[PDB]
Amino acid sequence: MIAVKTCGKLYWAGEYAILEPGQLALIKDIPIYMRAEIAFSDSYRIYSDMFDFAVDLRPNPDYSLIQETIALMGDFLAVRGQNLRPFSLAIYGKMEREGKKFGLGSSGSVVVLVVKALLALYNLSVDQNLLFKLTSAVLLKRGDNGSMGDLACIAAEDLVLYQSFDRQKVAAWLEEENLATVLERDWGFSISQVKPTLECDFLVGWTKEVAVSSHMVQQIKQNINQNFLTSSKETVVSLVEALEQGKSEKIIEQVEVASKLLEGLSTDIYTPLLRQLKEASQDLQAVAKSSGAGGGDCGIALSFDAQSTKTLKNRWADLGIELLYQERI
Ligand SMILES: Nc1ncnc2c1ncn2[C@@H]1O[C@H](COP(=O)(O)OP(=O)(O)NP(=O)(O)O)[C@@H](O)[C@H]1O
Ligand SMILES: C[C@@](O)(CCOP(=O)(O)O)CC(=O)O
Ligand SMILES: [Mg+2]
């Protein structure tokens, strides 16, 4: 057996705006892993601990995302002169607790995970951009309403500055042209590392209220206007520059602008608990905001001194917020 793993992700800035082609988002990798075990066998067997039953390749709704990923990979392997053969695949480490997902991008992680598993099983490797394209193709083919930012971050497993591409356009290419031709074209996206140059604690507060990404996007996308898109893009650029220049005060400023833009976009993004999560940092050398589609899941914080981190943690503790993850940037 060969084992592989994929991380999770959490947006720092650029949410919603990133849905429009050419926009920017700053996305952070989270080392909480989805894991897989794969080996050739005499029949196809696929099991994910998110469910209480296994399936083979015959279509099943619970497993459709995984099966569609395998199907796309069957085509990729063909391009590379390889034929799909029966294998047993086990997926575990579901990014949920007590039946509730954390909000770490499990959908995107499992697609990258399965692509990684089949590549490893077939002794093949692909670079970062190709991995992103292969995993993105799966979501594009099923008409996903996401920006693919989660795939960009998980593929890179780093804090990345992601520039979105036109998903409707690439999906059209995939429906009309052979996969190799589509993969070889420049899609027009960008994924690059952002390395902060100052010390700081990164905290993740889980509100334990599940928020469905596709539902949030479906209802809030109509609220997106140009003023928001322009402001968001500038804010992501300024935040990246602040992190790279190591200026705490400018980071606090831009994260606050990002948060206010989200609040203005929709009253559904900030739930009372997500709002309390960011309010807990208002008088500290730290800053916080909702992360992702909002409507539940997690909030993130960046703290610039020991005292601020201690107080922020105590406040979140008293607020019923679970400290899901913490890291010294
Ligand atoms: N571990 C898994 N095993 C099998 N399928 C999964 C798994 N994780 C996610 N999926 C599929 O992805 C769907 C939605 O992803 P989910 O993890 O629920 O939230 P999400 O779409 O990632 N939103 P967010 O987690 O906030 O980025 C699930 O309903 C399944 O279809
Ligand atoms: C709202 C959105 O911009 C980010 C969603 O973030 P998350 O999947 O809730 O962590 C949607 C997307 O970009 O796919
Ligand atoms: Mg979410």
mmCIF file of all heavy atoms in Angstrom, residues 9 101-105 211-213 291-294 296-298, ligand 3:
data_model
loop_
_atom_site.group_PDB
_atom_site.id
_atom_site.type_symbol
_atom_site.label_atom_id
_atom_site.label_comp_id
_atom_site.label_asym_id
_atom_site.label_seq_id
_atom_site.Cartn_x
_atom_site.Cartn_y
_atom_site.Cartn_z
ATOM 1 N N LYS A 9 -7.549 24.219 4.329
ATOM 2 C CA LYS A 9 -7.310 25.615 3.979
ATOM 3 C C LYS A 9 -8.271 26.591 4.660
ATOM 4 O O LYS A 9 -9.384 26.225 5.029
ATOM 5 C CB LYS A 9 -7.434 25.786 2.467
ATOM 6 C CG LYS A 9 -8.845 25.510 1.944
ATOM 7 C CD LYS A 9 -9.667 26.798 1.855
ATOM 8 C CE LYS A 9 -11.171 26.522 1.874
ATOM 9 N NZ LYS A 9 -11.645 26.141 3.245
ATOM 10 N N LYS A 101 -18.634 19.472 10.077
ATOM 11 C CA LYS A 101 -17.392 19.828 9.386
ATOM 12 C C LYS A 101 -16.809 21.083 10.026
ATOM 13 O O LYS A 101 -17.556 21.912 10.553
ATOM 14 C CB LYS A 101 -17.667 20.100 7.903
ATOM 15 C CG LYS A 101 -18.898 20.973 7.660
ATOM 16 C CD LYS A 101 -18.839 21.756 6.344
ATOM 17 C CE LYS A 101 -18.125 23.088 6.526
ATOM 18 N NZ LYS A 101 -18.351 24.014 5.375
ATOM 19 N N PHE A 102 -15.485 21.233 9.977
ATOM 20 C CA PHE A 102 -14.829 22.408 10.550
ATOM 21 C C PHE A 102 -14.926 23.611 9.621
ATOM 22 O O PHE A 102 -15.099 24.740 10.073
ATOM 23 C CB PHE A 102 -13.335 22.173 10.803
ATOM 24 C CG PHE A 102 -13.018 21.010 11.701
ATOM 25 C CD1 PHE A 102 -11.980 20.143 11.364
ATOM 26 C CD2 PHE A 102 -13.688 20.817 12.902
ATOM 27 C CE1 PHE A 102 -11.610 19.106 12.213
ATOM 28 C CE2 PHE A 102 -13.323 19.776 13.764
ATOM 29 C CZ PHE A 102 -12.281 18.923 13.416
ATOM 30 N N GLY A 103 -14.782 23.353 8.323
ATOM 31 C CA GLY A 103 -14.821 24.414 7.323
ATOM 32 C C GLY A 103 -13.461 24.577 6.668
ATOM 33 O O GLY A 103 -13.183 25.604 6.028
ATOM 34 N N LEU A 104 -12.620 23.553 6.808
ATOM 35 C CA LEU A 104 -11.255 23.551 6.270
ATOM 36 C C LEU A 104 -11.101 23.184 4.790
ATOM 37 O O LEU A 104 -9.981 22.981 4.318
ATOM 38 C CB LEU A 104 -10.364 22.620 7.103
ATOM 39 C CG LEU A 104 -10.207 22.976 8.584
ATOM 40 C CD1 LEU A 104 -9.301 21.964 9.256
ATOM 41 C CD2 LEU A 104 -9.652 24.367 8.727
ATOM 42 N N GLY A 105 -12.206 23.100 4.065
ATOM 43 C CA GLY A 105 -12.124 22.783 2.649
ATOM 44 C C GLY A 105 -11.974 21.302 2.327
ATOM 45 O O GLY A 105 -11.204 20.924 1.446
ATOM 46 N N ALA A 211 -21.625 25.721 7.924
ATOM 47 C CA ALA A 211 -22.029 26.597 6.831
ATOM 48 C C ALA A 211 -21.697 25.946 5.491
ATOM 49 O O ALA A 211 -20.537 25.631 5.223
ATOM 50 C CB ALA A 211 -21.317 27.937 6.947
ATOM 51 N N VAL A 212 -22.716 25.753 4.655
ATOM 52 C CA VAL A 212 -22.539 25.142 3.336
ATOM 53 C C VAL A 212 -22.061 26.182 2.320
ATOM 54 O O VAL A 212 -22.795 27.109 1.973
ATOM 55 C CB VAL A 212 -23.872 24.523 2.836
ATOM 56 C CG1 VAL A 212 -23.642 23.748 1.536
ATOM 57 C CG2 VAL A 212 -24.456 23.620 3.916
ATOM 58 N N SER A 213 -20.833 26.017 1.843
ATOM 59 C CA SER A 213 -20.232 26.944 0.882
ATOM 60 C C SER A 213 -21.061 27.238 -0.364
ATOM 61 O O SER A 213 -21.256 28.398 -0.726
ATOM 62 C CB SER A 213 -18.860 26.427 0.449
ATOM 63 O OG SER A 213 -17.980 26.349 1.553
ATOM 64 N N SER A 291 -13.692 33.768 8.158
ATOM 65 C CA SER A 291 -12.854 33.144 7.139
ATOM 66 C C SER A 291 -13.682 32.247 6.232
ATOM 67 O O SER A 291 -14.337 31.322 6.698
ATOM 68 C CB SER A 291 -11.754 32.311 7.797
ATOM 69 O OG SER A 291 -11.031 31.595 6.818
ATOM 70 N N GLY A 292 -13.649 32.523 4.934
ATOM 71 C CA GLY A 292 -14.409 31.726 3.995
ATOM 72 C C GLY A 292 -15.743 32.354 3.637
ATOM 73 O O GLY A 292 -15.882 33.575 3.576
ATOM 74 N N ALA A 293 -16.737 31.515 3.399
ATOM 75 C CA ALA A 293 -18.056 31.995 3.032
ATOM 76 C C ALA A 293 -18.772 32.654 4.222
ATOM 77 O O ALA A 293 -19.762 33.365 4.040
ATOM 78 C CB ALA A 293 -18.884 30.823 2.521
ATOM 79 N N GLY A 294 -18.248 32.430 5.423
ATOM 80 C CA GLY A 294 -18.889 32.957 6.623
ATOM 81 C C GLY A 294 -20.150 32.131 6.853
ATOM 82 O O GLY A 294 -20.272 31.037 6.301
ATOM 83 N N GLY A 296 -20.972 30.685 9.448
ATOM 84 C CA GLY A 296 -20.645 29.634 10.386
ATOM 85 C C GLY A 296 -19.172 29.294 10.235
ATOM 86 O O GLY A 296 -18.372 30.160 9.899
ATOM 87 N N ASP A 297 -18.825 28.036 10.471
ATOM 88 C CA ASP A 297 -17.442 27.586 10.363
ATOM 89 C C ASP A 297 -16.470 28.379 11.238
ATOM 90 O O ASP A 297 -16.765 28.665 12.397
ATOM 91 C CB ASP A 297 -16.982 27.608 8.898
ATOM 92 C CG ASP A 297 -17.712 26.580 8.036
ATOM 93 O OD1 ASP A 297 -18.510 25.782 8.578
ATOM 94 O OD2 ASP A 297 -17.478 26.567 6.804
ATOM 95 N N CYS A 298 -15.325 28.757 10.678
ATOM 96 C CA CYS A 298 -14.293 29.443 11.449
ATOM 97 C C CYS A 298 -14.027 30.911 11.171
ATOM 98 O O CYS A 298 -14.404 31.447 10.141
ATOM 99 C CB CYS A 298 -12.954 28.744 11.264
ATOM 100 S SG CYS A 298 -12.867 27.039 11.780
HETATM 101 MG MG MG B 3 -16.741 27.574 5.028
#
